[PDB]
Amino acid sequence: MKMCRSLPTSEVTLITECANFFRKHNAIPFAIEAYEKVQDHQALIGIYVAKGDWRNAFTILEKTPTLAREVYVPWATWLADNDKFDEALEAFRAAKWPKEAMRLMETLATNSVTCRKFRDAAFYYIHLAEEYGRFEETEKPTDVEKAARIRRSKECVRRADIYYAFSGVYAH
Amino acid sequence: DMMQWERALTLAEQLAPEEVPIISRDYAQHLEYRGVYAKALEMYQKGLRQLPTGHASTELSVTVQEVERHNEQCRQGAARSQIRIGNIADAMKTVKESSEVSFVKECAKLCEENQKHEEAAQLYEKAGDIERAATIYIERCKNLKAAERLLPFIKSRNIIGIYARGK
Amino acid sequence: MSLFVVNAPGHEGQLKEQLIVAHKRRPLLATAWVNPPSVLITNSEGEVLTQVADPPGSTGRTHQPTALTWHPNEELLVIGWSNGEMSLWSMPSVSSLALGEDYTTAAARSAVQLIAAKAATQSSAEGATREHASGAVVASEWSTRGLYLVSASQQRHVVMWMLEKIPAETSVTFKLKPLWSVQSREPVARIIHVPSKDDISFLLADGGTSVTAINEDQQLFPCVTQQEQIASVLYDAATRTLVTLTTTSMIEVYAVGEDIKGTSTLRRKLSAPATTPTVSTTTGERIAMSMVWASPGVVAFGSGDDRLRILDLSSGSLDVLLLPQPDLHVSSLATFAAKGTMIVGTVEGFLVVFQHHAAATEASQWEAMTVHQVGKCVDRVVLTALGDVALCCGGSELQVLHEIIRKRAWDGVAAATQISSDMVVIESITGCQCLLQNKGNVHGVSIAFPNIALWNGSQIDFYMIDEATSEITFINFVLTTSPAFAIHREGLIYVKGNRIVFETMQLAPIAQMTFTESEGVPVIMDIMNDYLVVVSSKNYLRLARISTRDLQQLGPARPLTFLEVSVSGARVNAQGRRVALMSTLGPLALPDTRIWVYDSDTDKMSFFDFGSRNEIPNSVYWNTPEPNTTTVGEFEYILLACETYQIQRPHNIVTFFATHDGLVLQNFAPLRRYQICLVGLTIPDFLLASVKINGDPNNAEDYVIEQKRLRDFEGLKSDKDVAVREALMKFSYYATIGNMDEAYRCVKSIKNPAAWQGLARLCVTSGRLDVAAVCLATMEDCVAARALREAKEDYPDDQDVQLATLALGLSMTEEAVELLRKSKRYDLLTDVYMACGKFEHAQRHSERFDRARIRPVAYKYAQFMESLQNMDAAIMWYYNAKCASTDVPRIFFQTNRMHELRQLMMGEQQSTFATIFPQNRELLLWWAQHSERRHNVQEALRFYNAGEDVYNIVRILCSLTPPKLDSALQLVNKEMDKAKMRFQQQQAFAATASARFGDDDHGEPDPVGSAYFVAQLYERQGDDQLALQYYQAAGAYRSGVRVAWKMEQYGVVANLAMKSSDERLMLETAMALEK
């Protein structure tokens, strides 16, 4: 710590390396101080994610709007393991990652159908149809896959209309 | 799942006209494993379908490739089946208008058994291999005129030693 | 499995259990009997070799032998009597007889050792009585190299004896001469010797508190000192360890160095309770302590209890390895270091044999192989050089148990099984099950029905069954000694001397050409149909074909390529081409974990090991073709079945196809407890000499044959089904090969749907589905075919889920988890776990492992209970599923139990319901809606306020006559206050980074929908200017502009249209403004 505060702000890389040395030897607060002095937002976010604090992570997110994914994704899986599946679904919707959003939306729409929460199932299916057009930026689908997902989008829109209409009749 | 494709087609006449040919092709596939595909031609001829007419969007665009792939597979099956019937001349236009190496290779095997050695000779040189083509030439076809054009491209002197006896 | 043959050399004399000894290298055994006092010296099989009494000169005083010891390398015994006379029994050596050099087989050696034991001699040591001073020799001991002897008597006299080997002019004699005459403090019980790594130094123990050693310095000095009485001392020469277990059962292990001084290393208190001890009153003596060296570094002891206590000197760990049952009083113990086997003798009459695993937890290394119920109390247990175990039963009784494999045979008509030493059960497929007893013990079984030959070592007796009268009678014997003999329809083929003799039932010679020493003596032979295999003592293999007249040798003698690996069994297939070989390891006849297949066409020898499966085999069998059935297929001739057991043991039967390329494993088949073993194979059935499920395994008469079906021979409606059976065997072969493309054609001839089911199971195991769709749809399993089609249609990218669906449709259910266990498909296996009726497994799986589907599990269980008409559990689980907003009221309304629901909303078990029901906010809201639509407005208001549903409360208050406007305004403004609080909190939180970053983010608080009605009230009162504020506060942009029309205002119209952020709201207000 003494040599860390001996250093000026010019030698950024050396302070980042010694903050890494802090982190490997579980010197978490010292790593926080060094990363703060070098305003290394990504490492602050990572160490807070591993730690557990989220308010600090979002304060860091406020200064840098372009670092959204690497905060939301561990936030999304933390919400998922804390059984707040609707909130986890919303977080996945925010931070792209369409594979896990797809799976969680399938499970939620299925749960709404089997538990006869027809308004919930209608909402899940009508937004699942919209999600069926979401692909990862690394993958450019063929026209065959585009059709194979357009058909499921139209089918899910139809299912959403049917379930939303049927909710009131079943209630009556 | 009953494999009564006959009555499946029978009810598809009035239920689903568009579903009619697809089941048909599947029927022929099962016949492929039993050698009773002598009747597996009319459904291939019935597999034709009018082009989807409509707006030029993707919805009318993507399906074209799938239905054309189905047509190509059906014509492949028809060309494969026509060999043992005795309609090699009709199948030759489809075979020589094709591009697939494996399909032509599979079609070329059975032409010798019907003693239709001219079409077999035409397919052997385009089958992708010339050594086995010349081996069949010198043992069965005995057509040195076609083998003369393949002489610079074969290094098998044991083939040449029987080839040059009557050359 | 295997069993002991029990030979009891009959004598009515009282055996002393303490005086049975065994030569450690030569296979002999000496016993001392009282009344009459004598010594029976027998071989390792219990056969009497000689009987010894007092040397002549006795005036009627037939003295009583008191100690017997063996020479460590010579065939020499020394006997200390009751009078102190020291006799020496010596048999002349075989090489001294100068007979022929062919005496290398076991039987010739046995015969010559028998005649030499009959030609043995007894000598007397001079002055030995005086040195012991007419005292009974209570102990004696040879050195490790066996040229120093020590004799200790009850007068505490200890004498050292030097051994002098005098080569006579025609023989070799021995003499024992005294050296010292020292005295101990007490009559010494056990004398041990120590080697230097020759050196003369003997430890002595009198059973007291201190042990006294003596060395060449003629000094008797203690080594270890204990304050309590010691009973038995265990010495390990390799580590020189000296383990003493006290009479109070305390561990004292001493490391002993060259100074002959014991240093304690492990000594920890053991708490053995003294609450009602089982004092041995049946015997009238103190319970004998028992410990022996179980393994190098590990010492075992049994305390006479039902437990066996092992102690690892390397780690200091003492633990217990229990017997398979409780209630077993251990009496004596012994261990064979050659096989790593412990022998546990019980007072109830059980011998338990423990085998080293290498011959997890350390205690699992030992495991009990065989439990032999002798039915008599055992006194002492002594092993021999070869592994044969002698027992002292009932004091005056002695038995010798020799371990063998159970002889059995299957000709094709009837199966013969051995069940005892001399009891054989012969059982046909016609029900002709009968038991036969032999004069001597069973050593070889051969059957060609109804002729059946049993070999008892010295001779073979072939019995004839007249099934018309079912009468069996001995006719004549063939006095031969070879283990090679086999009977046939043509005749009996055995070995006499070097000759392999083929004769008829009346012993009419058929083939006779004299063999040579280079060709050697055949030891093994196998007969089936018209083919024979002979294996000599030198690995030579002679295939042969038997005919009506001759023995056509199919080729010359052949050797095979594998301490050394011998051959013990061979079976040839029905083509007379492939031979299955059972190998053994080492001269100790240790079993081998691999089996061999010799193909004469390619002359190859392939093999397959069972140590990869943690298994040891016992026998191998080919498919025997049925009698009078020559139309059996070729592949059906090559299937091989092997009986294996893992290291009441598990039983397995494993099937192989003996192809040219090697051994391809077909399938395993576990056997039940009543299924004792396998006797024969005849496709499609393993023929097992089992016992009844409810029957008595102890009964010798309950041995009934069972034809266990082959696993891939199900659905055999017709026993004459020939083409279907052959094509099914071909399909099984092709499945073992694997390339299922022509295995598809292997079953087309078959119309038995069980073959289609087996093909579908193969399709599951492989991973091919286009074949499998036809496999399903040709059996018309439209349920499973529908499931497969739906799996393909909905999950096209994944093939493992379609494989799992196919496996589920094939009535095999354990595979679904194993398919995609860790790569995650937890939902589908949750559905499968529910679909098996195991809700209490699915919910506990999902609680820890699959948290996203607890609610479907609860809802499915609630539906399950509702269909069971148990509204209690159904209601509580519809509560647990968080669906009580719509489903618990459904049950109460459709059971017409609405009075109870009203009671709950406004009995010990009712406490559980009333704990949760009255405060369930969803239930409050539902009851409020119910009473609101029941025209009970005020009860609705009460329950809405109990459920804090602001929107409904505001709607009701603005709907009432008079409209309670002020309370509605208060609640609306309270919600506007909370919305402002949230917006201001988020805005102030965001403004920290907005201090440097100039952002014109015109965020607004969440509008309150409940304000809408309030504006409606002003919309009905002409206070439209007031209504517009609440409409904007509600987010009613359309209603906002609807209000804004009448002001003749356009700016509010425009900005509300902009704030609407929906295209139509400016799209029409554009030309609304233009006019």
Question: DSSP characters for C822-865?
Answer: SS--HHHHHHHHHHTT-HHHHHHHHHHT-GGGHHHHHHHHHHHH
Residues of B in contact with C774 (CB under 8 A): 3, 30
Give the sheet arrangement for strand C172-183, strand by strand.
Answer: C137-142, C148-153, C157-167, C172-183
Least Cα distance to C197 among C166, C239, C229, C228 occurs for C239
Residues near C502 by beta carbon (within 8 Å), at least 6 away in sequence: C490, C491, C492, C493, C509, C510, C511, C512, C546, C551
> Rounded to the nearest 10 degrees, how much is the dihedral formed by the CA atoms of A15, A17, A20, A21?
-100
- Minimal Cα distance from A143: which residue of B? B62
Given an 8 Å threshold on Cβ–Cβ distance, is A104 in contact with C852? Answer: yes
Q: What is the 3-state secondary structure (H, E, C) of C49-110?
A: EEEECCCCCCCCCCCCCCEEEECCCCCEEEEECCCCCEEEEECCCCHHHCCCCCCCCHHHHH
Contact predicate A72/A87, CB 8 Å: no
With contact defined as beta carbons under 8 Å apart, do C147 and C49 qualify?
no
Smallest Cα distance from C992 to chain A, Å? 8
Selection from C636, C520, C644, C638 nearest residue C582 by Cα: C644
Any long-range contacts for C238-246 (C-beta under 8 Å, 24+ apart)?
Answer: C238/C296, C239/C297, C240/C194, C241/C313, C242/C203, C243/C291, C243/C299, C243/C313, C244/C211, C245/C289, C245/C291, C245/C301
- What's the rounded Cα separation, in Å, for the pair C194 and C862? 78
Total residues found in chain C within this entry: 1075
B156 Cβ under 8 Å from any chain A Cβ: no
Experimental approach taken = cryo-EM
Contact C1014/C958 with Cβ under 8 angstroms? yes
* DSSP code at position C783: H
- Say if residue C36 is preceded by a cis peptide, omega within 30 of 0: yes
Nearest to C853 among A111, A116, A171 (CB): A111
Within 10 A of C1049 (CB to CB), how many other CB atoms are there?
A: 14
> Looking at beta carbons, which residues of chain A come within 8 Å of B63?
147
Contacts of C22 (CB under 8 A, 6+ apart): C28, C29, C30, C44, C70, C382, C383, C384, C385, C390
Task: Decide if A16 contacts A35 (C-beta within 8 A).
Answer: yes
Interacting residues of C243 by C-beta distance below 8 A, sequence separation 6+: C233, C234, C236, C251, C252, C253, C254, C291, C299, C313
Find, among C621, C609, C531, C599, the residue nearest to C565 by Cα.
C609
Give yes or no for C884 touching B (CB within 8 A): no
Alpha-helix residue ranges (DSSP H) falling in C675-718: none
Q: How far is B62 from chain A (nearest CA, A)?
A: 6
Give the DSSP H or E segment for A158.
helix A143-171
By C-alpha distance, which of C787, C667, C669 is closest to C736? C667
Question: Rounded CA gap, C833 and C839, in Å?
Answer: 7
The b/e string for C186-209 (b: 16+ C-beta within 10 A; e otherwise) is: ebbbbbbbbeeeeebbbbbbbbbe
Which stretches of C102-261 are DSSP H helices? 106-118, 128-132
Say which residues have a Cβ less than 8 Å from residue C839's Cβ, sequence separation at least 6.
Answer: C857, C860, C861, C864
B33 touches C: beta carbon within 8 Å: yes
DSSP H or E segment with residue C706: strand C704-709
Say whether C776 and B33 touch across the interface (CB within 8 A): no
Q: Collapsing DSSP states into helix, strand and coil, what is residue B117?
A: helix
What is the dihedral sign for C-alpha C667, C672, C676, C682? Answer: negative
Contacts of C175 (CB under 8 A, 6+ apart): C123, C125, C163, C164, C166
- Coil, strand or helix at C1052: helix
The three-class DSSP label of residue A51 is: helix
What letters, b where the CB count within 10 A reaches 16 and e where it falls short, cover C390-400?
A: bbbbeebbbbb
**Hey, what are C317's tokens?**
């760990």
CA-nearest residue of chain C to B2?
C777
Cα dist from B95 to A114, B127, C491, C499, whole Å: 54, 11, 70, 74
* Identity of residue C1040: G
Give the closest-approach CA distance of C431 to chain B in angstroms. 45
The residue assigned the tokens 């001073």 is C133
Cβ–Cβ below 8 Å for A114 and C860: yes
Cite the DSSP H helix spans in B3-143.
5-12, 20-32, 42-46, 59-85, 88-96, 101-108, 117-125, 131-136
Q: Which two tokens stand for residue C343?
A: 């022998």
CB-nearest to A62 from C856, C860, C992 is: C992
- Residue A107 main-chain phi, psi, to 5 deg: -65, -40
Q: How far is CA C28 from CA C19, C66, C117, C386, in A?
A: 14, 19, 10, 10
For chain C, the residues before each gap (C–N > 2.5 Å) are 197, 359, 562, 647, 906
**Contact at CB, A111 and C855, closer than 8 angstroms:** yes
> What is the residue whose two structure tokens read 């689980």?
C877
**Number of residues that make up chain B:** 167
Within 8 A by CB and 6+ apart from C713, the residues are C683, C684, C725, C728
If contacts are CB pairs under 8 Å, which of residues 54-93 in chain A contact chain C?
A: 59, 62-63, 80-81, 83, 85
Which residues in B lie closer than 8 A to residue A150 (C-beta atoms)? 58-59
Residues 17-36 (B) with a CB less than 8 A from some CB of A: none
User: B81 Cβ partners below 8 Å, 6+ apart?
Assistant: B28, B37, B38, B40, B41, B44
* Cis status of the peptide bond prior to C167, with omega within 30 of 0: no
CB of C851 within 8 Å of a chain A CB? The answer is: yes
> What does DSSP assign to residue B140?
I
Place of tokens 């004399």: C13
A39 CB within 8 Å of a chain C CB:
no
H or E element, residue A75:
helix A69-81
Does A59 sit within 8 Å of C855, measured CB to CB?
A: no
Cα angle at C653 between C648 and C654, to 5 degrees?
A: 140
3-state SS of C452-504 is EEEECCCCEEEEEEECCCCEEEEEEEECCCCCCEEECCCCEEEEECCEEEEEC
Pairing of strands C662-671, C680-682: unpaired
User: C2-401 has which fold?
Assistant: Methylamine Dehydrogenase; Chain H (2.130.10)
- Phi, psi (deg, nearest 5) at residue C692: -65, 150
Residues of A in contact with C989 (CB under 8 A): 62
Is residue C300 within 8 A of residue C291, CB to CB? The reply is yes
Amino acid identity for residue C162 in this structure? M
> What is residue B109's three-state secondary structure?
coil
What residues in C contact A104, CB-CB < 8 Å? 852
Q: C1009-1041 in b/e burial notation, b at 16+ Cβ within 10 A?
A: bbbbbbbbbbbeeeebebbbebbbbbbbbebbb
Q: Do B1 and C744 touch (CB under 8 A)?
A: no
Cβ pair C801, C828 in contact under 8 A: yes
Nearest CB to C777; choose among B3, B33, B34? B3
Contact between C465 and C472 under an 8 Å Cβ cutoff? The reply is yes
| Cβ–Cβ < 8 Å for C502, C478 | no
Chain breaks in chain B (C to N over 2.5 A) after: none
How far is Cα C930 from Cα C906, in angstroms, rounded to an integer? 14
Interface contact flag, C789 B3, Cβ < 8 Å: no
Contact between chains at A143 and B65 (C-beta distance less than 8 A): yes
Distance CA C507, CA C486 (A): 14
SS3 at position C750: coil
Q: Which residues contact C87 (CB under 8 A, 6 or more apart)?
A: C52, C55, C78, C79, C81, C122, C123, C124, C125
Q: How far is A155 from chain C (nearest CA, A)?
A: 13
- Resolution of the PDB structure in angstroms: 3.5
- State which residue of chain C sits closest to A85, comparing Cα positions: C852
What DSSP letter does each residue of C711-743 carry, written as one string?
TT------TT--HHHHHHHHHHHHHHH--HHHH
Query: Which residues in chain C are closer than 8 Å to A117, comparing Cβ atoms?
Result: 883, 886
The CA distances from residue C415 to C56, C251, C431, C644, in Å, are 56, 54, 11, 20
CB contact under 8 A, C852 and A81: no
Phi and psi torsions of C280, nearest 5°: -70, 90
Q: Of C250, C243, C254, C253, give the one whose Cα is nearest residue C269.
A: C250
Please answer yes or no on whether C853 and A171 come within 8 Å at the CB atom. no
The tally of CA atoms less than 13 A away on the side-chain side of residue C961 is 0
To the nearest 10°, report the CA torsion of C334, C336, C341, C345.
-20
What are the b/e assignments for C885-924, b being 16+ CB within 10 Å? ebbbbebbeeeeeeeebeebbeeeeeeebeeebeebeebb
Burial of C802 per CB tally in 10 Å (0-12, 13-18, 19+): buried
Nearest alpha carbon to residue C82 among C62, C100, C97, C106:
C62
Question: CA B44, CA B31: separation in Å to the nearest integer?
Answer: 13
Name residues whose C-beta falls within 8 Å of residue C711's C-beta, 6 or more positions apart in sequence: C667, C669
C883, C990, C994 member nearest A115 (Cβ): C883
C521 strand-pairing partners: none
Cβ atoms C641, C678 nearer than 8 A: yes
Q: Any idea what the Cα angle at residue A146 is, between residues A140 and A149, rounded to 5°?
A: 120
CA nearest to C574, candidates C486, C619, C631, C637? C637
Chain B residue with CA closest to C771: the answer is: B30
All residues of chain B having their beta carbon less than 8 Å from the beta carbon of residue C778 are: 3
A146 contact B CB<8A? yes
Q: Are C758 and C712 in contact (CB under 8 A)?
A: yes
CA–CA separation, A6 vs A9, rounded Å? 10
| CA C323 vs CA B87, C328, C589: distances in Å | 81, 8, 26
Q: At what angle do helices A55-63 and A41-51 cross, to 10 degrees?
A: 160
Q: Which of C973, C937, C962 is nearest to C1017 (CA)?
A: C962
Starting from the edge strand earliest in sequence, which strands make up the sheet with C423-428, in order? C408-410, C414-418, C423-428, C433-437
Would you state the torsion angle of the CA atoms of residues A137, A143, A146, A151, taken in this order, to the nearest 10 degrees? 180
Q: Do B1 and C785 touch (CB under 8 A)?
A: yes
d(CA C450, CA C453): 10
Looking from the CA of C506 toward its CB, the CA atoms found within 13 Å total 1
Q: Phi/psi of residue C941, each to 5°?
A: -65, -40
Whether A130 and C871 have beta carbons less than 8 Å apart is answered as no
Q: Tell me the residue type at C696.
A: D
Which of C649, C695, C699, C646 has its CA nearest to residue C668? C646
Residue of B nearest to C782 (CA): B1
* Test mutation, A103, A113, A115, A119, chain C, max C CBs within 10 A: A115
Q: How many residues does chain A have?
A: 172
To the nearest whole Å, the CA of A63 is away from the closest chain C CA by 5
Would you call A129 an interface residue with chain C, using a CB distance cutoff of 8 Å?
no
Pick the closest to residue C140 from C200, C75, C67, C213 (CA basis): C67
The residues near C28 (Cβ < 8 Å, ≥ 6 apart) are C22, C41, C42, C43, C44, C49, C70, C75, C384
